[PDB]
């Protein structure tokens, strides 16, 4: 009982620690991915802000 | 715009034919599931009848005095009718309620003070629309009939008989003997023989021709059903059982199981 119980609590606390490190990785993942995705949403927006002048010129001709 | 009218009418008849053949096929699949339930619930009652037959052959000289198996001939009657759940029914519920009227006709004529325990939704609709017949309890099929409906009906019939108020609790139902003809039967339920056979309303042991375990096989190219006589029953041997409980209490605890078995099998056969 003591070997299996210490094994259970030890494995579960090491699960806490390794999934805590994995939590650190996911927090960094979300922060970095928001830093990336801001750029792509601004990219499609600026595609619109240029395409308005593009269609302006297309009808200017 | 008459040709579009005929075109849409033809389309509606095509769709109605499609959905009627779909209902036919899914009803056949549910017939297969009902025979599955029946042949799966059988061996419980097989071991029950072999145990009970041995027990009552050891308990004839005794005094057993169990309230379910006593014969109180002061002649009240509790006829229980079980009908179909939903509609289109072929001609199920009509002939069921018709035999119900015929039975209460012979009953009231003899002044035996009958009553009715309606089980099916169509039957209980018929009875709430006709209050000239007295009725005790109401049941339905939205609840599953394989366990809970049968358990509730057994509870109510047990509470009706053990509290010795009415005699002769019989059940009118419809054993599946043919795909076109389904003639209803009236079998008694609680005033049972201690040997433990299903009886007629006369009592003349219709287990002789009960024809258990129906199955479905086609004959040439159309669907039919096959019903044989005897299957996988081993009732003969009677070993020493060493009763720890008092023998009257053993049957007193055994007979509710037989009540539940008979009620459940009758529900499954009518379904």
């Amino acid at each position: 009982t003591i070997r299996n119980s210490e094994e259970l609590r030890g494995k579960a606390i090491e699960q806490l620690e390794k999934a805590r490190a994995r939590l650190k990785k996911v927090e960094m993942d979300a922060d970095q991915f928001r830093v990336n995705g801001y750029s792509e949403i601004e990219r499609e927006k600026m595609n619109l802000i240029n395409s308005t002048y593009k269609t302006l010129e297309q009808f200017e001709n | 715009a008459n040709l579009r009218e005929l075109r849409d009418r033809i389309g509606s008849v095509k769709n109605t034919q499609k959905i009627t053949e779909a209902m036919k096929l899914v009803a056949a699949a549910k017939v297969r599931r009902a025979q599955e339930a029946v042949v799966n619930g059988r061996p419980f009652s097989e071991t029950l009848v072999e145990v009970l037959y041995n027990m009552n052959e050891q308990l004839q000289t005794e005094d057993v005095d169990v309230p379910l198996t006593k014969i109180r001939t002061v002649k009240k009657v509790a006829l229980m009718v079980v009908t179909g759940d939903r509609g289109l029914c072929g001609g199920f519920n009509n002939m069921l309620l018709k035999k119900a009227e015929s039975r209460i006709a012979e009953l009231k004529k003899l002044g035996v003070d009958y009553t009715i325990i309606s089980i099916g939704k169509k039957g209980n609709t018929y009875f709430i629309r006709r209050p000239e017949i007295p009725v005790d309890r109401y049941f339905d099929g939205t609840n599953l009939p394989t366990a809970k409906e049968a358990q509730a009906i057994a509870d109510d019939v047990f509470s009706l008989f053990v509290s010795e108020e009415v005699d002769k609790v019989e059940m009118l139902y419809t054993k599946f003997v043919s795909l076109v003809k389904s003639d209803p039967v009236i079998h008694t339920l609680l005033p049972l023989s201690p040997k433990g056979e299903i009886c007629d309303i006369n009592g003349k042991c219709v287990d002789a021709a009960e024809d258990e375990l129906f199955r479905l096989t086609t004959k040439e190219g159309k669907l039919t059903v096959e019903r044989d006589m005897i299957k996988t029953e081993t009732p003969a041997f009677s070993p020493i059982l060493e009763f720890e409980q008092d023998p009257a209490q053993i049957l007193d605890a055994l007979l509710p199981l037989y009540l539940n078995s008979q009620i459940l099998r009758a529900l499954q056969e009518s379904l």
């Binding site: - | 499609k18 959905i19 053949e21 779909a22 209902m23 096929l25 899914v26 699949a29």
Partner: protein, 141 residues
């Protein structure tokens, strides 16, 4: 009808088109059994659900024409069953996100479908990887 037939398709399209046609035919067969879907065999329920979520990828909005690679990947996903678990109000959104994701991230798939005009095993593997990745990213919601 089309009297020209499969000769008007590229080699990539026929492979998924055969399975799409067979599964849509089975759904058209079992369409009457939809009201009694509860009391049916599991294979029949599978064919019915596959049909009513293959019908959902044949919906399109006006003036948004799919390229041949996008529809190859859409038909492949639907006809194999990498959306047999989703709900009917999610198939269209998931397919839009998956198509944009694959076009943005895995251009080897578009290039192998476009230059060789066949559904290569490498395209199959790339599409399964992209399906798993977008399945995780969409289960995130």
């Amino acid at each position: 009808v089309s009297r020209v037939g499969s000769a008007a398709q590229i080699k990539a399209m026929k492979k998924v088109a055969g399975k799409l046609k067979l599964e849509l035919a089975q759904f058209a067969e079992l369409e009457a059994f939809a009201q009694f879907a509860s009391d049916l065999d599991k294979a029949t329920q599978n064919q019915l659900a596959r049909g009513q979520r293959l019908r959902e990828l044949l919906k399109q909005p006006q003036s948004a024409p799919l390229t041949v690679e996008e529809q190859v990947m859409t038909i492949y996903t639907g006809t194999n069953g990498y959306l047999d678990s989703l709900e009917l109000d999610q198939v269209r959104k998931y397919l839009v996100e998956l198509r944009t994701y694959v076009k943005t991230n895995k251009p080897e798939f578009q290039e192998i479908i476009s230059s060789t005009k066949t559904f290569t095993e490498e395209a199959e593997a790339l599409l399964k990887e992209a399906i798993q990745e977008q399945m995780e990213r969409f289960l995130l919601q």
